[PDB]
Design a protein around this ligand. Sequence first.
Ligand SMILES: [Mg+2]
Ligand SMILES: [Mg+2]
Lengths: 384, 396
Amino acid sequence: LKIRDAYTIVTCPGRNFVTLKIVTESGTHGIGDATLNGREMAVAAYLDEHVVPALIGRDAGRIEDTWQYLYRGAYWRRGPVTMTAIAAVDMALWDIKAKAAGMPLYQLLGGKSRERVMTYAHCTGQTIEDCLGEVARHVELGYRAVRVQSGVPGISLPAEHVWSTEKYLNHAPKLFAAVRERFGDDLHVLHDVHHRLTPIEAARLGKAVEPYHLFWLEDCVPAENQESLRLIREHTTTPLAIGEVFNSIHDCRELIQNQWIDYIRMPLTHGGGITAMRRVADLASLYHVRTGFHGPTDLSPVCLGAAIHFDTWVPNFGIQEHMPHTDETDAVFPHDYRFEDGHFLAGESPGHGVDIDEELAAKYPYERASLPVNRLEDGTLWHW
Amino acid sequence: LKIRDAYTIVTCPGRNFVTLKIVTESGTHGIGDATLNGREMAVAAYLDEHVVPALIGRDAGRIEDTWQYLYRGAYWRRGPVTMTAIAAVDMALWDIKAKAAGMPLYQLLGGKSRERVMTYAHCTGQTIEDCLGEVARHVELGYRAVRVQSGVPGIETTYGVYEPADSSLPAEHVWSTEKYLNHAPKLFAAVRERFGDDLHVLHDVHHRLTPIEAARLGKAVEPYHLFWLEDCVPAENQESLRLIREHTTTPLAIGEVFNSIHDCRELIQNQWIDYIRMPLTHGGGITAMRRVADLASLYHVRTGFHGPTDLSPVCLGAAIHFDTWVPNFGIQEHMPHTDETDAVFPHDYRFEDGHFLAGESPGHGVDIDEELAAKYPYERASLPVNRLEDGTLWHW
Ligand SMILES: [Mg+2]
Ligand SMILES: [Mg+2]
């Protein structure tokens, strides 16, 4: 199990993905997701030039040692590029270890804690009515949970969006009222605030939406300063989720220990892989916090498969976001996880159950694509 | 004046440097340091593929807007690659602004607060005696302050005993905390015995201790009155400094591995450190570091910018301008660059009698000679790792 080859693959079967492959002398291989949306080539370079050469000859079985070697050894610690590179290695090594053990990953982690993995779907629309149409559509597909978003009346390179907080705050509660009126109380309803509020504005929104009993209100405020959550938590009983933009337990230790959130959203690809996220989930468990992994299209099927395995074992599972990948993406990344009746089921193949078709990946060259930015009506560069 | 062109230059005149150059429609230009030791190409790619294209056509005068656009706009916030890229842009834009203003950078920032900026030199040796020899020679050169490091008997290799990134793949060092703790105070005792009390004496613990171990070391070295004890413990958990601060009056310095005000807000507000070490090229540039220095000032914390060979003369020049203006200046680290490096980056900052003097040329006073830079191709070099005697991957 000494490493004989390690290299990245960059491919764009509908959107960009970066993948790390590690191959042992014996021939067993593992893959890990290294995709960082809108900054993809920074991770590719971090891996190609600085990490991959150091992997050659290392014992692939030494997962923990390798994690610490890359984390501490980089000298400059934490960060999105850094932790995604480390996550990619970690995911590939856990893939290899599960294969060597002849077990699907969830078994190697401690076995199954649940029989299936609940997901939510994205329901979006220009008007509230448009959104309700999407909710009905996804309910018919078997989803037990939906994230709802609608437009606010009056509202390659980064697209430039315009934002008004005050108009959003007045309008948003009407969406949830309408969802409850049409679909009733049994449906789980989620909403993503996407970083745009100040804490007292989020406190106001949280209170306003209490009657509609949201599964969570997500990313209320930028949280580099973790104390930003305090005012929200002290003013509302609407459950709170945060963390898709985090990469370290150190981004959320205080959020969790002070009981300022209900769900932690940091995913495998950006959170330093299985090794690190086990520790985050375990810390969360002490405070009744549950996992809600970020699961957008910009995390590859490699992350999704590993996440479904993790979701299957972890005691404090909350929910798994599902944004379906394109057929082309699924073809590039064959996998054995299944979606049925609104839930994922983990694969039984040894490893995390995902592979990459390198020949096919090579047919979809990288295409630069950036995330949007958001400005206030006066032009102020805001949070998107 | 809009940005017409922006590009990186990668050169290795003794070691790797990455530089960002921004050129306006009028031809005026600015440069910023983008060097992240041992991970250089990650920053190069971040800039080349993802930042540079978005700079074209922007108003070069909109420094704040650009900083926010890149920081918030990246979506994934903070981190060494991210903030070094942003720092490079920021430094280049301030360079351009100062040139447009016809002023050296320190003037643009608020004018000079001091007539010279005190530095410290690195004194190192295998034995204590070897180190003392180095102190003697640096005192002779006019340094008012020295950092001292020496070998630990029974340990083959220790930090600072010199170009850390000296191998293609990481060198592997071995470490014993207990041997270091019993030996280190002997060094400082020897330095005071030979050189007396007026000299400022610094020491870098380089991340290797736990908090209570650093508390013990701090107490043990109180009699020697160190200027600072640096990087005692890894500080991703900022609370790691608390036990040290509660147990010793030896001054503490931290932060060369930080990149964000959010890495040190609590260290500062709780008064757990005396000097903040985060430098311009890794800490988001002038725009961000002004904010950090100002927060620090409310709590009597002073600046002590990291200044190793792996920050280019572009950073050093900009840092000297910053140091010249900032009220709560502490000290500026000086590790001399190679002749080849100084030639690639012509500059107007000066070193005299143990102090830096800021340049008077408009901008930060540093330029890059691209034809000369092209003579020195990138060569991979990685920082070492450190393992305990039992093989445990530790902190280097
Ligand atoms: Mg979200
Ligand atoms: Mg240091």
